[PDB]
Design a protein around this nucleic acid. Structure first.
Ligand SMILES: Nc1ncnc2c1ncn2[C@@H]1O[C@H](COP(=O)(O)OP(=O)(O)OP(=O)(O)O)[C@@H](O)[C@H]1O
Length: 536
RNA sequence: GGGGUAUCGCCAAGCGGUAAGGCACCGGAUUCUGAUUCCGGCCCGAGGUUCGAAUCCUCGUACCCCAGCCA
């Protein structure tokens, strides 16, 4: 699987510019990982292992205020669950606070940084606009000695938040807004989840990232398009300090998925306002969310592989994702039987009850063996599989016609019974005793009512009603009210041996898995990962 | 103003020499899952250089990103 980045790497390896590849995944611990991060993970860890190099996991913990320890734990969990391993110990940008501080001092001594006292509002007014250039701060020309003294003052906590900041001295007229004296350090009297209260000054992203990459020996730092302008500051910092290597940044387009949101702020909001059970709600585009929904690490790696790596903005269709999980489960998931919308079907022609039929664990893979499924007179079938009268297109069960039960005989509808609402409460039928192993075209699933197992089924759907929910003025007001719908049904007996993690394919229905969060020893709960491809 | 992008369902190969593949959708074969499997259907605009242009050049047009003491 190739892309413009792997081609850049091949070239460097050929020209001799590098003899090894070292990448990194640098997530900020301010939320859980989503399918978007997965693309970055596959790209970075995938390149490393393919080129026999290294890939680091570095928490970019530069803003204590919006970060929490809870997130570092789940992020590590998901990277591992995805099947990737990082080189060495988990790293943290905060592991470099002392070096970063020393580098700030180097820039100050070269006259390439200074302490600015412009207020947070003033800095915006002096910055200029997209069409107009900015103007130099009145403090831009302080002497080295004065900046040194003032920066130590900031570190010591002598300045209140927003009363001072260390800025790089570049060019207020640069067409690159990011190069208009970017803030390097800002004051925050906030406790840090790694360094506690040792620091009241914290380095900004642009100053931190490139130096962190450099120190770790990163050869190619891969990020998304929104940082293309930043690459100039990334290079400016490395070009102006004393450091032996200069990692190069290459940007690719972020993944966007139809009918869902990918921004951490929006996903957080959904969780905070309780519109979803939690970061791992089965309807969330998060890694943990997809996991609980029934997606396999393998399907996700396949997905990331299929969508490619380019510099083109894109929004992949949900159909693309679902395809990957179907392909995965259609080859490894054992087949079973279950009815989501139950309706009794009495075979009056059946003598009492008691029988056991052999059902394959996979209609295309005998190697998976076969189970022992029971068959009786009173069974359960899905209401959708029966109709009093229907076109020739309806291949299911109809009064006059006869159907075939999955891996069983061939029954024939006879009479029906309804309640005081017209709802069929029971379907009476009869069968052909000799059909174990006319032209009855049609097959439906079923669950012997005697050996039946009460089971709760959770059917999920798109979280939002529109393709691009993030583009709506209020993405919340566009949430799909039917994203989750609980159903009570019955499944064959061999489904009580289901363990959270195992994926079954309820024939004619789709792929499901046990939901440990709701599944009780009494009543099991199955999440529908995805429906089966359905089209007459 | 600067940075990027465009192979017309959604992605995406291509790097001067007969325009891949995946998803989606549409046909047909197999089928005791309306599944699966297997066949088949499917170069932003205008010029210019060139024997030859999706690939190079010029000028456009459309879209995305940048005016946090966020990342
Ligand atoms: N949607 C995405 N597709 C591919 N990579 C992504 C995506 N979102 C974030 N990344 C990248 O993954 C790495 C870690 O991202 P980070 O932890 O900073 O979250 P983030 O940038 O806040 O994500 P978001 O902006 O989507 O909330 C960075 O390189 C980031 O650019």
């Amino acid at each position: 699987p190739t892309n413009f980045i792997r081609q850049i790497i091949d070239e460097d390896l050929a020209s001799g510019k590098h003899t090894t590849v070292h990448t990194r995944f640098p997530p900020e611990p301010n939320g859980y990982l989503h399918i978007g991060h997965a693309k970055s993970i596959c790209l970075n860890f995938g390149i490393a292992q393919d080129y026999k190099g290294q890939c680091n996991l570095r928490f970019d913990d530069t803003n204590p205020v919006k970060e929490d320890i809870e997130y570092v734990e789940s992020i590590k969990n998901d990277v591992e669950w995805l099947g990737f391993h990082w080189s060495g110990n988990v790293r943290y940008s905060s592991d470099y606070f002392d070096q970063l501080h020393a580098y700030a001092i180097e820039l100050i001594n070269k006259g390439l940084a200074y302490v600015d006292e412009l207020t947070p509002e003033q800095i915006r007014e002096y910055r200029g606009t997209l069409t107009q250039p900015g103007k130099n701060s009145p403090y831009r020309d302080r002497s080295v000695e004065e900046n040194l003294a003032l920066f130590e003052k900031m570190r010591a906590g002598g300045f209140e938040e927003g009363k001072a900041c260390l800025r790089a001295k570049i060019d207020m007229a640069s067409p690159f807004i990011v190069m208009r004296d970017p803030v390097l350090y800002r004051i925050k009297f906030a406790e840090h989840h790694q360094t506690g209260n040792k620091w009241c000054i914290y380095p900004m992203y642009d100053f931190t990232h490139c130096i962190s990459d450099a120190l770790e020996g990163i050869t190619h730092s891969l990020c998304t398009l929104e940082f293309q302008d930043n690459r100039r500051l990334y290079d400016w910092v490395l070009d102006n300090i004393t450091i032996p290597v200069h990692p190069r940044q290459y940007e690719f387009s972020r993944l966007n998925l139809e009918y869902t949101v990918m921004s951490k702020r929006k996903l957080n909001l959904l969780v905070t306002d309780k519109h979803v059970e939690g970061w791992d709600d089965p309807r969330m585009p998060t890694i943990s969310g997809l996991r609980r929904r029934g997606y396999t690490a393998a399907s996700i790696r396949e997905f990331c592989k299929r969508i490619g790596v380019t510099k083109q903005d894109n929004t992949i269709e949900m159909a693309s994702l679902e395809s990957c999980i179907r392909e995965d489960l259609n080859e490894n998931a054992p087949r079973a039987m279950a009815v989501i919308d139950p309706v009794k079907l009495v075979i009056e022609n059946y003598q009492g009850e008691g029988e056991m039929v052999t059902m394959p664990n996979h209609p295309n893979k005998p190697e998976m063996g076969s189970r022992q499924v029971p068959f009786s007179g009173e069974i359960w079938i899905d209401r959708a599989d029966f109709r009093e009268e229907a076109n020739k297109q309806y291949k299911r069960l109809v009064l006059g016609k006869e159907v075939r039960l999955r891996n069983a005989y061939v029954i024939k509808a006879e009479r029906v019974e309804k309640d005081a609402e017209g709802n069929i409460t029971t379907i009476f039928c009869t069968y052909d005793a000799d059909t174990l192993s006319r032209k009855v075209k049609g097959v439906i699933h079923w669950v012997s009512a005697a050996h039946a197992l009460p089971v709760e089924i959770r059917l999920y759907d798109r979280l939002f009603s529109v393709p691009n929910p993030g583009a709506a003025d209020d993405f919340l007001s566009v949430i799909n009210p039917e994203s989750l719908v609980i159903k009570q049904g019955f499944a064959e007996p061999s489904l009580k041996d289901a363990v959270a993690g195992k994926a079954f394919q309820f024939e004619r229905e789709g792929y499901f898995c046990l939901d440990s969060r709701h599944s009780t020893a009494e009543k099991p709960v199955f999440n529908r990962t995805v429906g089966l491809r359905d089209t007459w």
